[PDB]
Amino acid sequence: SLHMIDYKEIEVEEVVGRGAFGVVCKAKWRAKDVAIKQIESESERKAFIVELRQLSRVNHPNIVKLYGACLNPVCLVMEYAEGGSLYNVLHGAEPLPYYTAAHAMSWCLQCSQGVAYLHSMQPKALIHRDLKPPNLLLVAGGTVLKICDFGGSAAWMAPEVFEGSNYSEKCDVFSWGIILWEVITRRKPFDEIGGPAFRIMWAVHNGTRPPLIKNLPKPIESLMTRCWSKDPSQRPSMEEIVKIMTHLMRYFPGADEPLQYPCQHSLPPGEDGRVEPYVDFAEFYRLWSVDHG
Ligand SMILES: CCN1CCN(Cc2ccc(NC(=O)c3ccc(C)c(Oc4ccnc5[nH]ccc45)c3)cc2C(F)(F)F)CC1
Pick the CATH number of 83-293 from 3.60.21.10, 1.10.510.10, 3.40.718.10, 3.40.50.970: 1.10.510.10
The CATH 1.10.510.10 portion of the chain extends over 83-293
Q: Could you tell me how many residues make up the chain?
A: 293
Q: Which residue numbers come right before each break in the chain (C to N over 2.5 Å)? A: 151
Q: What is the CA radius of gyration of the chain?
A: 20
The whole-angstrom separation of Cα 171 and Cα 282 is 32
SS3 of 130, please?
coil
What is the Å distance from ligand 1's center to 157 Cα? 18
Strand partners, 252: none
Contact of 78 with 222, CB cutoff 8 Å: no
The CATH 3.30.200.20 portion of the chain extends over 1-82
The whole-angstrom separation of Cα 159 and Cα 29 is 43
The set of catalytic residues is: 130
Give the β-pairing of 3-4 and 66-71: parallel
Is 21 marked within a binding site? yes
Task: Confirm or reject: Cβ of 63 under 6 Å from ligand 1.
Answer: yes
Is 190 marked within a binding site? no
| 2, 64, 130, 157, best to mutate for ligand 1 pocket (most atoms within 8 Å of CB) | 64
The whole-angstrom separation of Cα 182 and Cα 262 is 19
Elucidation technique? X-ray
SS3 of 187, please?
coil
The whole-angstrom separation of Cα 205 and Cα 134 is 23
SS3 of 41, please?
coil
CATH number of 1-82: 3.30.200.20
Contact of 235 with 160, CB cutoff 8 Å: no
> How many CB atoms are closer than 10 A to CB 166?
5
> Cis before residue 73, ω within 30 degrees of 0?
yes
Dihedral sign computed on CA atoms, order 249, 253, 255, 260: negative
Strand partners, 25: 15, 36
The whole-angstrom separation of Cα 158 and Cα 258 is 32
The whole-angstrom separation of Cα 132 and Cα 116 is 16
Nearest Cα neighbor of 132 from 152, 161, 106, 103 is 152
| DSSP structural state of residue 206 | T
Contact of 89 with 259, CB cutoff 8 Å: yes
Task: Confirm or reject: Cβ of 24 under 6 Å from ligand 1.
Answer: yes
The whole-angstrom separation of Cα 156 and Cα 173 is 10
Residue whose CA lies nearest to ligand 1 atom number 36:
148
Task: Confirm or reject: Cβ of 148 under 6 Å from ligand 1.
Answer: yes
| 78, 86, 112, best to mutate for ligand 1 pocket (most atoms within 8 Å of CB) | 78
Is 17 marked within a binding site? yes
Phi, psi values for residue 160, rounded to 5°: -70, -20
Q: What angle do CA 66, 156, 239 make, to 5 degrees?
A: 60
The whole-angstrom separation of Cα 64 and Cα 93 is 24
Contact of 128 with 115, CB cutoff 8 Å: yes
The whole-angstrom separation of Cα 43 and Cα 287 is 56
